[PDB]
Amino acid sequence: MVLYFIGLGLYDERDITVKGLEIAKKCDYVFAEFYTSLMAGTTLGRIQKMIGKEIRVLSREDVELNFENIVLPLAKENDVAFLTPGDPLVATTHAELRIRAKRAGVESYVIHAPSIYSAVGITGLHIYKFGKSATVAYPEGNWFPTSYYDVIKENAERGLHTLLFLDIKAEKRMYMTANEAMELLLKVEDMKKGGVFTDDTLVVVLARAGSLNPTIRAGYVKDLIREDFGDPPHILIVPGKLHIVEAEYLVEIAGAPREILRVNV
Alpha helices (H) in 86-177, listed in sequence order: 95-103, 116-119, 147-156
The alpha carbon of residue 199 and the mean position of all alpha carbons in its chain are separated, in whole angstroms, by 25
Q: Which of 99, 174, 191, 263 is close enough to bind a second copy by CB under 8 A? A: 99
Among the listed residues 163, 161, 182, the one whose alpha carbon sits nearest the alpha carbon of residue 240: 161
User: Which residues lie near ligand SAH (CB under 6 A)?
Assistant: 10-11, 36-37, 85-87, 90-92, 115-118, 165-166, 168, 206-210, 233-235
Q: Which of 85, 114, 233, 239 is close enough to bind a second copy by CB under 8 A? A: 114
108 labeled part of a ligand binding site: no
> What minimum distance in Å lies between the beta carbon of 249 and a second copy?
5
Using the Cα atoms of residue 13, residue 16, residue 22 and residue 26 in order, give the sign of their dihedral: negative
Using CB under 8 A as the binding rule, whether residue 10 contacts a second copy is answered as yes
Among the listed residues 242, 197, 199, 247, the one whose alpha carbon sits nearest the alpha carbon of residue 221: 199
Q: Which amino acid is at 130?
A: F
Beta-bridge partners for 265: none
> What minimum distance in Å lies between the beta carbon of 50 and ligand SAH?
18
119 labeled part of a ligand binding site: no
Among the listed residues 240, 238, 242, the one whose alpha carbon sits nearest the alpha carbon of residue 204: 238
Closer CB to ligand SAH, 249 or 264, in the complex: 249
Instruction: Choose the one of a second copy, ligand SAH, none that binds residue 224, judging by a C-beta under 5 to 8 angstroms depending on kind.
Output: none
70 labeled part of a ligand binding site: no
Sort 143 into a burial class: Cβ within 10 Å, 0-12 / 13-18 / 19+: exposed
- Going by C-beta distance under 8 Å and a sequence separation of 6 or more, which residues neighbour residue 206? 116, 119, 120, 122, 123, 214, 215, 216, 234, 235, 237
Question: Taking contact as CB under 8 A, which single stretch among the options 73-81, 184-192, 198-206, 245-253 is the one that binds a second copy?
Answer: 245-253
Q: Where are the beta strands (DSSP E) in 138-248?
A: 162-166, 168-169, 174-175, 202-207, 215-220, 234-238
Using CB under 8 A as the binding rule, whether residue 212 contacts a second copy is answered as yes
Question: Taking contact as CB under 8 A, which single stretch among the options 63-71, 88-96, 173-181, 231-239 is the one that binds a second copy?
Answer: 88-96
116 labeled part of a ligand binding site: yes
Q: Which amino acid is at 104?
A: A
Position of minimal CB gap to ligand SAH: 86
Using CB under 8 A as the binding rule, whether residue 64 contacts a second copy is answered as no
| Binding region for a second copy (CB under 8 A) | 7, 9-10, 12-19, 21-22, 50, 86-96, 98-99, 102-103, 109-115, 117-119, 121-122, 124, 126-135, 154, 158, 160, 165, 209-210, 212-213, 245-246, 248-249, 252-253
Q: Which residues are annotated as a binding site for S-adenosyl-L-methionine?
A: 10, 87, 90, 115-116, 166, 209, 234
